[PDB]
Design a protein that fits this description.
Entry title: PHT1 in the outward facing conformation, bound to Sb27
CATH superfamily of the largest domain in chain A: MFS general substrate transporter like domains
Helix content of chain B: under 10%
Assembly: trimeric
Number of domains of chain A: 3
Helix content of chain A: 55-70%
Number of domains of chain B: 1
Radius of gyration of chain A: 24 Å
Order of helices and strands of chain A: HHHHHHHHHHHHHHHHHHEEHHHHHH
Order of helices and strands of chain B: EEEEEEEEEE
Largest sheet of chain A: 2 strands, antiparallel
Oligomer: heterotrimer
Distance between the termini of chain A: 28 Å
CATH topology of chain B: Immunoglobulin-like
Distance between the termini of chain B: 38 Å
CATH class of chain B: Mainly Beta
Strand order of the largest sheet of chain A: 1-2
CATH superfamily of chain B: Immunoglobulins
Structural class of chain A: mainly alpha
PDB class: membrane protein
CATH class of the largest domain in chain A: Mainly Alpha
CATH topology of the largest domain in chain A: Growth Hormone, Chain: A
Structural class of chain B: mainly beta
Largest sheet of chain B: 6 strands, mixed
Number of strands of chain B: 10
Number of helices of chain A: 24
Number of strands of chain A: 2
Keywords: Peptide transporter, Sybody 27, SLC15A4, membrane protein
Chain A: Solute carrier family 15 member 4
Shape of chain A: globular
Number of helices of chain B: 0
Chain lengths: 494, 124, 124
């Protein structure tokens, strides 16, 4: 991959470009995702339900185009060619929003003023939805291939600093751009995300000589499908396909097929992990609005509570906790780090159950009204800083489980399908988000009504969020027991 | 530490051409720029050509631009310098040097750290 | 890159039988399906039967079921199309083709890539 001379400098300019093209591809994803519903409910007039459904369709495309944005990378174009293609759409879609916001050109694109603009928003969102679902499956294996020459020790040290750079785009975008959008303007606010992705396309292209790339091999999939047809239409059942067993196929080819049959059961065991992890991202923010916020205030800053620890725990975990666990033989595998990470998610949901339970006690005595993001909430008279204990326990769960889920998906996939297997990883995380979104509605049915009284921008004091968190912990203690069963069988047969 | 050995030097008449070779050894995974320097008697040492081992983007001096070629052989870890239509003025000792960081002013000697014995070329 | 050689063409009367064979010269691998297409003069092309080289499943056209048989011979690498109870409506030109993908449609003509010269068969 790299010549002997100058190797050290050739993998610091190949990991500086990949890590500086994920900080800028991410600072332009929270620029559009963060203050979207607020933007649409402006003087010029979507409703509460309509505005959100554009932010739920936009995310749906992001998860559902990863596996198909990976198959395209390992069959036709390759990881480098397809990332440049994706960032072209990502930029092309991102140019609709500045035009829509600007009163000068808003009429031309949206159309005649209603003396709305649904056509330009969806064409803008779909293209951005395609760009972020295909860049997100091809930069993660492409980044870690630069340093793979130095063994698994160097691959792990990459995903530590590839996840500290994605979380440095949340703090930079949810903090900087969000403030500019609400207060300064929306033409300026939505123009920085379009410029940021412009630089990412150029920095990635300019560093074309540092990267080490491999030509696509389309015959990997064509053979793989045939193996399935032969086995299903005719010891694991894939053994027959080998020549040694009388089948008409090679030996190593059948090995790749048997590698996908074993990886898949592990991914299906993480759907309960994502479900009880995207619900704590959403329900926590609802709880914070109902606590005494210290004495406008963008509603985005309430979301970066946990992306300011992952910014200060990874440097600590990458220089003080990793080496200590290395010299001692204590936790080498990657499916043993995930099972540890799924334990702090259990204690985090349970921790927030006690905080909420006492909070409902206070409101019955007295409440203090406050306004956040132009609406009013009946917050309790308890400081928001009581919510630190439930966010630290999530700072330790996005270090053992988010950074070890990527490492396992990459290091346990055939070398001919390393983008279609990170693509699936990010598609089974979508199945996780939408399973939970259905779980919230179920528990909010008239029969149970633990959150029936809740509505858009609605008070939750009448609701009972206390019981909901305990349910998240219960469904997270069950999966932890299950994931140990499947994890043990995977390593045993490995 | 790194070590360099020059070779290919000699004495030729006007219009000659030589392929100076300068092999490198040691921990050769931390070398960014390689170059060649001329030091005529009574004059301060001056650069001739420089090369990058990570991108291949060469460099040259206006004094000798258009007639010198510098390349690398990753297989042999050796750099070859070619001179076309030599002149008596260029007659002087030559060196090859490495540098762990030289992306600014690669032709200035103070950037480089490692150095070799050097070779002498005579043109008349 | 792949070429198919036809053979066995001929003409017979009503109630006769024939054994058509179409050989192949391209890569034995990289081929998933083989099919036979019958097209009368000045008439739209239509498919007769298809055969898969990995499973062996046969998809005989609904309009010619029960009167034509197709088999594969790996040793000879040349498929055969046995025919019986020939009728005048079968009088037409015949084509054999391969493809790199047939899990979509085994009979639709808009899938096969490589084609052959074809052979004319007349039934009186």
């Amino acid at each position: 991959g790299r010549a002997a001379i100058g190797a050290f400098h050739g993998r610091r300019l190949a990991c500086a470009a990949v890590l500086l093209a994920e900080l800028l591809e991410r600072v332009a994803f929270y620029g559009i995702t963060s203050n979207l519903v607020l933007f649409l409910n402006g003087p010029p007039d979507w409703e509460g339900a309509q505005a959100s459904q554009a932010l739920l369709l936009f995310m749906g495309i992001t998860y559902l185009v990863s596996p198909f944005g990976g198959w395209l990378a390992d069959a036709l174009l390759g990881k480098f060619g397809t990332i440049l293609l994706s960032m072209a759409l990502y930029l092309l879609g991102m140019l609709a929003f500045p035009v829509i916001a600007a009163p000068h050109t808003r009429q031309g694109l949206c159309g005649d003023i209603p003396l709305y603009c649904a056509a330009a928003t969806f064409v803008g969102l779909v293209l951005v939805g395609l760009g972020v679902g295909s860049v997100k499956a091809n930069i993660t294996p492409f980044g870690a291939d630069q340093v793979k020459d130095r063994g698994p020790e160097a691959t792990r040290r990459f995903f530590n600093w590839f996840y500290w750079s994605i979380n440095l785009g949340a703090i930079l975008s949810l903090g900087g751009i969000a403030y500019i959008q609400q207060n300064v303007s929306f033409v300026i606010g939505y123009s920085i995300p379009a410029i940021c992705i412009g630089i990412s396309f150029m920095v990635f292209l300019c560093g074309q000589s540092f990267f080490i790339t491999k030509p696509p091999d389309g015959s990997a999939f064509t053979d793989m499908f045939k193996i399935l047809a032969y086995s299903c239409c005719s010891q694991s059942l894939f053994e027959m396909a080998k020549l040694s067993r009388g089948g008409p196929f090679r030996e190593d080819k059948v090995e790749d097929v048997k590698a996908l049959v074993k990886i898949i059961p592990v991914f299906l065991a993480l759907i309960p992990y994502w479900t009880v992890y995207f619900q704590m991202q959403t329900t926590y923010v609802l709880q914070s609005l109902h606590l005494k916020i210290p004495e406008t205030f963008p509603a985005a800053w309430l979301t970066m509570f946990d992306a300011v620890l992952i910014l200060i725990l990874i440097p600590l975990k990458d220089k003080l906790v990793d080496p200590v666990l290395k010299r001692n033989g204590l936790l080498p595998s990657s499916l043993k780090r995930i099972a540890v990470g799924m334990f702090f998610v259990m204690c985090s949901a349970f921790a927030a159950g006690i905080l909420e339970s006492n909070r409902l006690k206070i409101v019955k005595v007295k409440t203090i009204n406050q306004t956040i993001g132009n609406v009013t909430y009946h917050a309790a008279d308890m400081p928001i800083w009581w919510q630190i204990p439930q966010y630290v326990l999530i700072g330790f769960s996005e270090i053992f489980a988010s950074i070890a889920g990527l490492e396992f998906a990459y290091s346990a996939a055939p070398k001919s399908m390393q983008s279609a297997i990170m693509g699936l990883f990010f598609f089974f995380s979508g199945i996780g988000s939408f399973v939970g979104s259905g779980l919230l509605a179920l528990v909010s049915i008239k029969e149970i009504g633990w959150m029936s009284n809740h509505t858009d921008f609605g008070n939750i004091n009448g609701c009972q969020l206390n019981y909901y968190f305990f349910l998240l912990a219960a469904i997270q203690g069950a999966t932890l027991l299950l994931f140990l069963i499947v994890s043990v069988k995977y390593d045993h047969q490995k | 530490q790194v070590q360099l050995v020059e070779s290919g030097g000699g004495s030729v008449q006007a219009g000659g051409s030589l392929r100076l070779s300068c092999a490198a050894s040691g921990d050769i995974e931390t070398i960014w720029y390689l170059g060649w320097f001329r030091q005529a008697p009574g004059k301060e040492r001056e650069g001739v050509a420089a090369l990058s081992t990570v991108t291949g983007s060469t460099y040259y001096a206006d004094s000798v631009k258009g007639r010198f070629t510098v390349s690398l052989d990753n297989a042999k870890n050796t750099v070859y310098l070619q001179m076309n239509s030599l002149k008596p003025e260029d007659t002087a000792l030559y060196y090859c040097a490495a540098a762990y960081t030289g992306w600014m002013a690669p032709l200035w000697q103070w950037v480089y750290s490692y150095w070799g014995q050097g070779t002498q070329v005579t043109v008349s």
